[PDB]
Structures are given as structure tokens and as C-alpha cells.
From Swiss-Prot, chain A:
Function of the protein: Catalytic subunit beta, of the mitochondrial membrane ATP synthase complex (F(1)F(0) ATP synthase or Complex V) that produces ATP from ADP in the presence of a proton gradient across the membrane which is generated by electron transport complexes of the respiratory chain. ATP synthase complex consist of a soluble F(1) head domain - the catalytic core - and a membrane F(1) domain - the membrane proton channel. These two domains are linked by a central stalk rotating inside the F(1) region and a stationary peripheral stalk.
Subcellular location: Mitochondrion inner membrane
Coiled coil: none
Modification N6-succinyllysine, positions: 51, 56
The protein's name in its UniProt record: ATP synthase F(1) complex subunit beta, mitochondrial
Gene: ATP5F1B
Positions that bind ATP: 1, 3-6, 31
SUBUNIT field: Homotrimer. Component of the ATP synthase complex composed at least of ATP5F1A/subunit alpha, ATP5F1B/subunit beta, ATP5MC1/subunit c (homooctomer), MT-ATP6/subunit a, MT-ATP8/subunit 8, ATP5ME/subunit e, ATP5MF/subunit f, ATP5MG/subunit g, ATP5MK/subunit k, ATP5MJ/subunit j, ATP5F1C/subunit gamma, ATP5F1D/subunit delta, ATP5F1E/subunit epsilon, ATP5PF/subunit F6, ATP5PB/subunit b, ATP5PD/subunit d, ATP5PO/subunit OSCP.
Binding-site list for Mg(2+) 1: 5
Protein family per UniProt: Belongs to the ATPase alpha/beta chains family.
Chain residues that bind phosphate: 1-5
In-chain residues carrying the UniProt-annotated modification Phosphothreonine: 104
Chain positions with N6-acetyllysine modification: 51, 56
Full-protein positions shown: 209 to 369 of 529
Curated annotation (Swiss-Prot), chain B:
Subcellular location field: Mitochondrion; Mitochondrion inner membrane
Species of the source: Homo sapiens
Sequence positions bearing Phosphoserine: 11
Lineage: Eukaryota, Metazoa, Chordata, Craniata, Vertebrata
Keyword Amino-acid biosynthesis: no
Biological role: Subunit F6, of the mitochondrial membrane ATP synthase complex (F(1)F(0) ATP synthase or Complex V) that produces ATP from ADP in the presence of a proton gradient across the membrane which is generated by electron transport complexes of the respiratory chain. ATP synthase complex consist of a soluble F(1) head domain - the catalytic core - and a membrane F(1) domain - the membrane proton channel. These two domains are linked by a central stalk rotating inside the F(1) region and a stationary peripheral stalk.
Single GO cellular component term: mitochondrion
The name this protein goes by in its record: ATP synthase peripheral stalk subunit F6, mitochondrial
Swiss-Prot record, chain C:
Coverage span on the entire protein: 150 to 203 of 256
Membership in a protein family: Belongs to the eukaryotic ATPase B chain family.
Protein encoded by which gene: ATP5PB
Function of the molecule: Subunit b, of the mitochondrial membrane ATP synthase complex (F(1)F(0) ATP synthase or Complex V) that produces ATP from ADP in the presence of a proton gradient across the membrane which is generated by electron transport complexes of the respiratory chain. ATP synthase complex consist of a soluble F(1) head domain - the catalytic core - and a membrane F(1) domain - the membrane proton channel. These two domains are linked by a central stalk rotating inside the F(1) region and a stationary peripheral stalk.
Complex and partners: Component of the ATP synthase complex composed at least of ATP5F1A/subunit alpha, ATP5F1B/subunit beta, ATP5MC1/subunit c (homooctomer), MT-ATP6/subunit a, MT-ATP8/subunit 8, ATP5ME/subunit e, ATP5MF/subunit f, ATP5MG/subunit g, ATP5MK/subunit k, ATP5MJ/subunit j, ATP5F1C/subunit gamma, ATP5F1D/subunit delta, ATP5F1E/subunit epsilon, ATP5PF/subunit F6, ATP5PB/subunit b, ATP5PD/subunit d, ATP5PO/subunit OSCP.
N6-acetyllysine: residues carrying this PTM: 5, 13
Name of the featured protein: ATP synthase peripheral stalk subunit b, mitochondrial
Subcellular location: Mitochondrion; Mitochondrion inner membrane
From Swiss-Prot, chain D:
Keyword Transmembrane among record annotations: no
PTM annotation (N6-acetyllysine): residues: 27, 58, 67, 73, 80, 90
Subunit structure: Component of the ATP synthase complex composed at least of ATP5F1A/subunit alpha, ATP5F1B/subunit beta, ATP5MC1/subunit c (homooctomer), MT-ATP6/subunit a, MT-ATP8/subunit 8, ATP5ME/subunit e, ATP5MF/subunit f, ATP5MG/subunit g, ATP5MK/subunit k, ATP5MJ/subunit j, ATP5F1C/subunit gamma, ATP5F1D/subunit delta, ATP5F1E/subunit epsilon, ATP5PF/subunit F6, ATP5PB/subunit b, ATP5PD/subunit d, ATP5PO/subunit OSCP.
Residues found modified as N6-succinyllysine: 73, 80, 90
Signal peptide: none
Name of this chain's protein: ATP synthase peripheral stalk subunit d, mitochondrial
Function noted in UniProt: Subunit d, of the mitochondrial membrane ATP synthase complex (F(1)F(0) ATP synthase or Complex V) that produces ATP from ADP in the presence of a proton gradient across the membrane which is generated by electron transport complexes of the respiratory chain. ATP synthase complex consist of a soluble F(1) head domain - the catalytic core - and a membrane F(1) domain - the membrane proton channel. These two domains are linked by a central stalk rotating inside the F(1) region and a stationary peripheral stalk.
Entry's family note: Belongs to the ATPase d subunit family.
UniProt-recorded Gene Ontology molecular function terms: proton transmembrane transporter activity
Organism per entry: Homo sapiens
Part of the full-length chain shown: 6 to 108 of 161
GO CC, alphabetical: mitochondrial inner membrane; mitochondrion; proton-transporting ATP synthase complex
Amino acid sequence: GVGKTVLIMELINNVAKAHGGYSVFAGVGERTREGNDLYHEMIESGVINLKDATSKVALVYGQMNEPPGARARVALTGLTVAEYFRDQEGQDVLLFIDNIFRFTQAGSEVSALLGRIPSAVGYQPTLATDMGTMQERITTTKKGSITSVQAIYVPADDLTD
Amino acid sequence: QTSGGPVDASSEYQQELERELFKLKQMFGNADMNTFPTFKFEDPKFEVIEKP
Amino acid sequence: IDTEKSQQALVQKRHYLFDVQRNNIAMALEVTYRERLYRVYKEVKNRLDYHISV
Amino acid sequence: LALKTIDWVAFAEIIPQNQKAIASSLKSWNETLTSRLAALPENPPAIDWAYYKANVAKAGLVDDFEKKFNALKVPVPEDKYTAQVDAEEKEDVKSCAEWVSLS
């Protein structure tokens, strides 16, 4: 209900203008309908330019109809295309992750497929290290910085999940 | 044999050195740090402190 | 009579306002002087160690 | 830095009711100067060239930079304000001396 795509697009615009930072948007486990909606809203509002080279965001999408491996590595794909900007252009990149809980649950599905024994509630035994090996690359190095805006879903409304 | 080439036949590793030193200078100072500094000073404000 | 005497005592103690003006002016200018000292000191050391670091 | 001994509400007995804010504002400023002078030392810690001559690879840049330093006159601030308040105090001493004479 509340306008969140507008806040995301405005953060992209501002960070591109105030600083010189480009943005990356990862689409972990996203609904293809909402992905198309976001693509067209960002084309309309000028953040994406189909006819010039003045686009301020790169898009990476792993939809919901993709195997758990895709949905698990798509956040890393976005992280890599942002790390390039940071470490080779000294920019202050903005990396969005449209849902981090779907990243967690895709890792859970992957580890389940590989035959590993689940842990508390059913998540992977490597939940903390899998989250860490990703989030530890969103840092501020001596070359630049990556600031991450990660939409969060709280399952069953339990903040202790 | 490298007095003829400061960084041993590179023509590379410079594109990043310029950026790194850019940060280096940029926040070590924002002037001609090679120079000696000339100083503008400012001195305090004051008001009517006698009995009005 | 006693009220007059108390007024006399107060107006005797009067001079603290002026000597406080004095103290504040002195302290302010001393602070400014030492701040200039440290300004120039810090910044020339900053140039020097900039050269060292690079 | 020579300073004057001070009582504080002895300073508030004498302050009239038209400039209380001015008075305790000067009080607050006094406290700001107390802590601020108490914080930093008197003189800056001078710097050794041996660590700065055996380190810099530039030609004598250490020596001429620090020579300009050790040959620098920093502008000493001047009072320009104690005399006027001293004269004001003398005049008030006169005024209230005659007041107490009448009384």
C-alpha cells in the first residue's frame, strides 16, 4: 500500500545526483508481475533510459519460477555487479535487495535438496554463514562503498524467527 | 634495472594509483599540500557588557 | 537602619560583575591564542605526514 | 594566565533585575572558558626532525617547512577590552561611594 517503489527510485536518483553513485537492484525471489511493474515504473520516472546512456540502475532478477539455486545466487550476482562499480570506479553504490527473506529461504531449499539436516524451524544448518558470506561484501572499503537497502519479510510476525 | 622506468615497465597499475592517491590527498587535505600554508585568522565577537 | 546597612554591604560587593567581565575577556582571548597555536601546529604536521604517507 | 578569585551568588546579590539573563549568560560563558582552557595544555608539543629527516625522501622539504615553522610569528591576540570595563568599574565605584555617603 504505502509507496515503497517511489522511495527506492528516489534513493537511486538522489544517490546518483548528490554523490556519483550508480545503483543495482537485485530481484531475489520476486514475482514476475511485480518485476515488470518495477521495470516500467523505473523507465517512466527516468531512472532507466531506454534510448540514452544515462540510466542510473542495473537490474538483476531471479524470479519465483526459478530453481532454488538461481534464487539463492541472484543476490550474489547483484552484489558482484555492484562490487565492480565500487572497486573499479570508487563510487558509493546503492544495492537494493527486494527481499532478503526469500534469499534465506532459497538457501534453505538448496541445502534441503543437497540432503543436509535442517536446523531450528527448518532453516539450513549454514544459515548464519550463508548470510554472512554475502552481507560481509556489502562494506565500505578504502576504494569506495556499497550501501544496501534490503526489504525484509518477518515470517509469522515473529521477530525472533 | 629500473631507474629508467619508475615502476618497472608497467604502463599499468597507474589507473588505480591515481584513484587511491586521489582519496589519499582528498581527505588528507583539500589544498596544495605540497606547499607551506598561509593563514587567515579570525578573532572573537564582543558586545555591550556595561550596565544598560 | 539595618536595611540601610544591608544595602551598604551589597553595594560594597558590587565589583564582582566588573571583575567577571575581566575574567571572561581574558579567558576568551587566551583560548583563542592557544587555538591558533594548535591550528597552525596541527595543519603543518598534517602537510608533513601527508608527504610521509604518500 | 592570571585570574581573579570569584564567588558566584555573591555576584548575584549585586546584579539588578533588569539584566539577570545577561549576568548568568556571562556565568555560562565563564564556565565554557573554564573547561576549555582546562582541556588543552599551554604549548604545543614540538616535533623532532630525526623522525622527519630520516623519513621524507624530498630534498630538504622537512628542513624548510619546519624552518618556516620555527621562523613563524603567530598573531598574539590583544585585549582592547579590559581598560574600558576597568574605567566603567571606577565610575561605578564613584557613583555608589556617593550613594553610601548620602545613606
